[PDB]
Symmetry: D2
Subunit: 289 residues, 4 copies
């Protein structure tokens, strides 16, 4: 079965971005010309995932709901659910248990921005895996902040460590994961770590130990950004602005992606673009069709 | 009488920023490391103004209230009032009539960033002005978007025009205004312009016609920025980032300004910083004391 | 025959960048952390091309020679030749006639930056092409500045126009070209255009008219940037900075590419890095091995 | 006597910016739209200094000479001299001894960028000091890299330390200094420090100990940037670009400054702008007059 369900974890406390996240969800902050959540949303769409559960805080879940609605305007089926407190990424599968049911499911972090040639191609392989799980390894400047994958001399991934003191490599596990149905049972049996969180890295270690984990390499030609600090947030925005100004094309425009994947037709695009044509966003869409 | 009351117009529509501003007020958007409204708030505070009225939309007013509270944490007296519809800058004096009472009052637009050596000094002259009004003239590249001031050969401001098809100069009127109590009656008597808005420029033209308007020059040494477009918003963030990274000092940090102007003392800063010391903002405040 | 020779057109006038380019060649300007010419040089190297001719102005050729030497430090064979006057891109094949001999040859503009996942792969098809030529089509916002390709309903490129008043599409021809040996005779027979230049576009039109031109699409997933204006130059630098800061990996580092493609081995890298280990570039190279 | 002579130290090895400074002097690198040296040059001009000695490396001194000439086109008198090796900032006064003669003299580092309201006013005070010296203290993020000034509780500067291990404050001494004639004798008697350089900080300590040093504060409202790293270089450029795009005015344009200070007239500006009107720089100047 092709993965057809996805969860966007869009909550957290956002303490590092304080005070910008004091009155606005990190996932609603702009990345140049569109809300941050539009990016991970576009990533799932490109992967062919149209049934998506969005999870956020008790305060912000209603806000995403208000901005996105049921997502039928983009040919999607959006559902919402609250995570009482940011107790860990793995909790996404406990909260989303009903939604997931007996199906495979992808997980993408609400602040993750992916961009690059063949990204869709890269995700399809994971989407079509009958069972097991697929995560992606990306070379980053400071491994210590993430789940770090260790490889042997042959290039085989042999272990994963959450925020190691001494990273065994500079390869971090990205915020995009693809799982078969067994992840729900794994999450339910996890016990909090010393830092009191349900670790998704423990989930991934389990798949690895069962020999069911594909650590797909996401090359340097791809861009994987997260907006962890004020600094990285602005760099991400400059990155996006440069590409869009140069190409005259938009990065992660859901309306566009839905149109090109035939989720909606030109008439639907025209209606959505109407209210947005007082600036380039809407004019872009009108021109697109 | 020194101007001791101020109003921040923090509402509006933000069409030029859709869909960014669909689910986030322009004034809540981050400008590098803090919400946009911290800048105009700081500008008033630096002028010695502590009693401030915050006006926004029906939906966003409560959000600013949640973000700022009554402002006592910073030695301020903040109040809030809703602007039913974004019918014009001048409407700020109608909505804020009770708040203003019989006193002088300043108005600053929520998306305006002012920065420069001796900015406090420049404002102090306006703050101490007995009667009449003071506005500021700043040289910009696209004057047509603003209220534009015409000067005669001697350099005396002789007329103002809102968005003229043909600017008589490249000097725009900034979003910081100081008025005496007569502005309230002026606003109550304005008729909407062809574009259906109560024009702050008509108020300024009235003071100028009565010979009561001081058009103070705000030189090139100062930075006056707007964040109405994707472009201006990212440029402002980069601008602020450069300054702060270099100085190790923050631009428009309310806690810091409140401390340096003795609105609050060290213990209060220490108390505010504690629960925030986990992020750089907290560390910044502790280093300060 | 695989394309094993390349030419970098690194001269020109740079009027749009005066006075920046009055005392510094556009190709010597930094793009974040390395001179501009390192990028096109890397592009050729990634295509497996080691024998490269660098063409510049009478004044600047010696500077590039001092910067790059004979390239043996990176397992390359670099040569230099002066372009008396910036009389057109196509003049590159007249000046480089002896260098080319009877072989195939690639041409890359000195101010062109290419980046993206699988870029090497895309070039390899051109590199292996038996005869004819290959150029790349990229979607941009201001096509009028470039050679523009027209496609029919089926998507087949049917015509090219240099700076048309009315672009027939938004696809510009990039600054990376692959040619068979017949390009030399074509260039020697060109007559200057009304703007008095030997047009590379006329050469491309010739291959297209003989049905020997492959117009390969370079998708939105790739970044193709120019640095002809103040604006494009700073945007490119910010673009590169974001990528590198995030990855802890450098874009177009000749030493690294030479190492990864086995042009040189570890000892050589270690020897080059030693005297540079005092700065981050040296540290970067040592970390690499 | 008003200081009427100035020296721009524009040499050094630039190792930190390697490889960008391998084939281009750090002082010829662009800062958005003009060579870096145009900035310190503009600073001396604003201070009323028209007789300036430019010092660089054996290789680059001729390049500045070629770009700037005798500077009479801007109403200046430029002289050039080589510093065999970067043996320290204080060496500027030994090399420039003949040039200085019996007069007072200012020193500005070739990579220093100063900007802010009243900068000229700030410098005039130092320019008019009969004797002694004036340096400026600026709060920076990392004091350790500069000469650091320690102050007592009253705000009086009491000591200076070059690159202290434990900075006694976050105030660094900027790259702009104003001296009376006694600095030449001081420089001649200095002995190299442990790091083998003639320290300008020892010069400044001498003035301080003789009670002849004015440590003028350069407030946070001013911007003082140096382009030490690739990162700071790009931030400086973004800073300049934002201000210029917003104001429609240029920062540190020598042609403009010479015109406004009446060093040259409109006709001279028109002639210089002619060759530069293929881009905004020249058009700016033409419009200016
Ligand atoms: C942990 C945790 C994170 N998040 C989502 C929010 C982010 O988009 C994504 C990334 O993890 P984090 O970035 O670390 O989320 P965070 O906001 O807690 O970061 P910090 O407070 O240190 O600044 O995960 C949740 O929704 N729930 C959670 O329980
Ligand atoms: C390898 C390598 C690639 N490149 C740039 C060239 C391409 O635009 C981009 C991608 O080339 P590719 O390496 O072939 O694509 P990749 O994303 O698979 O890279 P990897 O898996 O090895 O991390 O990287 C370099 O600049 N330096 C290098 O050392
Ligand atoms: C008009 C109007 C503006 N504003 C404040 C919001 C902004 O901070 C400041 C500047 O006004 P504008 O920016 O021009 O109003 P806007 O936010 O609707 O922008 P757009 O053209 O994209 O729709 O004035 C109000 O609060 N109330 C109003 O009635
Ligand atoms: C005049 C002038 C100043 N400057 C820079 C130097 C200072 O850092 C900054 C401000 O110096 P000042 O010009 O004297 O301050 P200002 O803000 O009053 O400028 P004005 O009223 O003339 O618009 O401007 C230039 O770069 N070019 C110029 O032509
Ligand atoms: C024309 C021409 C360009 N060039 C190279 C330089 C650039 O890297 C690349 C792009 O050409 P252009 O950039 O358009 O040439 P230019 O540098 O003169 O730009 P400007 O319009 O500001 O004067 O081609 C040459 O080397 N020789 C030439 O005869
Ligand atoms: C199509 C499409 C892709 N993408 C992003 C997703 C990927 O990171 C990147 C490239 O995916 P791909 O589109 O499949 O790669 P491409 O370079 O071949 O694109 P094309 O030939 O259609 O111009 O573009 C969008 O943001 N919006 C879109 O409408
Ligand atoms: C030391 C020294 C510096 N310089 C000038 C060059 C710079 O504009 C200015 C600033 O000092 P530095 O910046 O440290 O000069 P640098 O190029 O040696 O820096 P680094 O090699 O560590 O990257 O001083 C000289 O001209 N001569 C000298 O002897
Ligand atoms: C003090 C202070 C000023 N400001 C901004 C407001 C002004 O635009 C700019 C300059 O205000 P001023 O402080 O009066 O000018 P300054 O350059 O003399 O500052 P100082 O000597 O104290 O370092 O700094 C803050 O944002 N926060 C602060 O805590």
């Amino acid at each position: 079965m092709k993965t057809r369900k996805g969860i966007i974890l869009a909550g957290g406390s956002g303490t590092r971005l304080y005070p910008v996240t004091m009155a606005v969800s990190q996932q609603l902050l702009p990345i140049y010309d569109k809300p941050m959540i539009y990016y991970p949303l576009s990533t799932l769409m490109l992967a062919g995932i149209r049934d998506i559960l969005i999870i956020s805080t008790p305060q912000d879940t209603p806000r995403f709901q208000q901005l996105l609605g049921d997502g039928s305007q983009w040919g999607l089926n959006l559902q919402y659910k609250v995570q009482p407190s940011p107790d860990g990424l793995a909790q996404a599968f406990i909260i989303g248990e009903e939604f997931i049911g007996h199906d495979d499911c992808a997980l993408v972090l609400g602040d993750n921005i992916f961009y690059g040639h063949d990204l869709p191609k890269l995700m399809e392989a994971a989407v079509n895996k009958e069972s097991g799980a697929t995560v992606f390894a990306y070379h980053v400047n400071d491994p210590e902040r993430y789940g770090v994958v260790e490889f042997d001399q042959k290039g085989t991934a042999v272990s994963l460590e959450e925020k190691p003191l001494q990273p065994k490599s500079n390869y971090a596990v990205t915020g995009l994961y693809f799982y078969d149905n067994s992840v729900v049972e794994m999450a339910k049996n996890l016990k909090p770590s010393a830092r009191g969180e349900l670790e998704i890295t423990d989930i991934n270690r389990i798949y690895m130990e069962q020999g069911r984990l594909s650590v797909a390499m996401m090359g340097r030609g791809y861009a994987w950004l997260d907006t962890g600090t004020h600094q990285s947030l602005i760099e991400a925005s400059n990155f996006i602005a440069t590409i869009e100004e140069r190409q005259g094309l938009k990065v992660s425009c859901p309306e566009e992606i839905a149109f090109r994947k035939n989720f909606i037709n030109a008439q639907q695009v025209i209606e959505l673009a109407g209210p947005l044509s007082k600036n380039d966003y809407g004019k872009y869409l009108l021109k697109m069709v």
